[PDB]
Amino acid sequence: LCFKLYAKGKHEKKTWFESRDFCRALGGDLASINNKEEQQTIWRLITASGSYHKLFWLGLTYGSPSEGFTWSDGSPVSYENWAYGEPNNYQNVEYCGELKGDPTMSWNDINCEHLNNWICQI
Ligand SMILES: CO[C@H]1O[C@H](CO)[C@@H](O)[C@H](O)[C@@H]1O
Numbered sequence: 331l332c333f334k335l336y337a338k339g340k341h342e343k344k345t346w347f348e349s350r351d352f353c354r355a356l357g358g359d360l361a362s363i364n365n366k367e368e369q370q371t372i373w374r375l376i377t378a379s380g381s382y383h384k385l386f387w388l389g390l391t392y393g394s395p396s397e398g399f400t401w402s403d404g405s406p407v408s409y410e411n412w413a414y415g416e417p418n419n420y421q422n423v424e425y426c427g428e429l430k431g432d433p434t435m436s437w438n439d440i441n442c443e444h445l446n447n448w449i450c451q452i
C-alpha cells in the first residue's frame with residue numbers, strides 16, 4: 331500500500347471519522363503501521379514534505395473492551411509504538427490513535443473529535 335500525508339491548512343484539519351471518510355472516498359483507508367519499515371516510510375514522507383511537528387490520525391480506533399485498539403483496515407494489531415504512558419484513556423474520552431510526526435513516530439490515544447492532520451493508505 332501507498333501512504334500519503336495530508337497536512338493542510340489550519341482550518342482544514344479533521345476528526346478521526348472525517349479523516350477515515352476522506353481516505354475511504356479515495357478507495358483506501360486511514361493508514362495502518364504494521365512494522366518498522368512502514369514506520370520509516372512514513373517518517374521519510376514527513377521529512378520530504380517538511381511537515382514537521384504535526385500530529386496525524388492513523389487508523390487506530392478502539393474496538394470492544396475485550397479487544398482494545400484495532401486498525402480500521404482490519405490489520406492485526408501486532409507492531410505497536412505507543413509513547414511511554416500510552417494508551418492512557420486520559421479523562422476517559424480517548425478512543426482513537428494519533429501519530430506524533432517526530433523522529434520517535436510514537437502513538438497516543440486521543441479524543442476522536444480532535445481536529446488533526448491524517449495519513450491515508452491507498
Ligand atoms: C494532556 O493530554 C495530552 O497529553 C497526554 C500525555 O501527557 C496524552 O495522553 C493525552 O492523550 C493528550 O495528548
Ligand SMILES: [Ca+2]
Pocket residue numbers: 416417418419420424438439440
Ligand atoms: Ca492519551
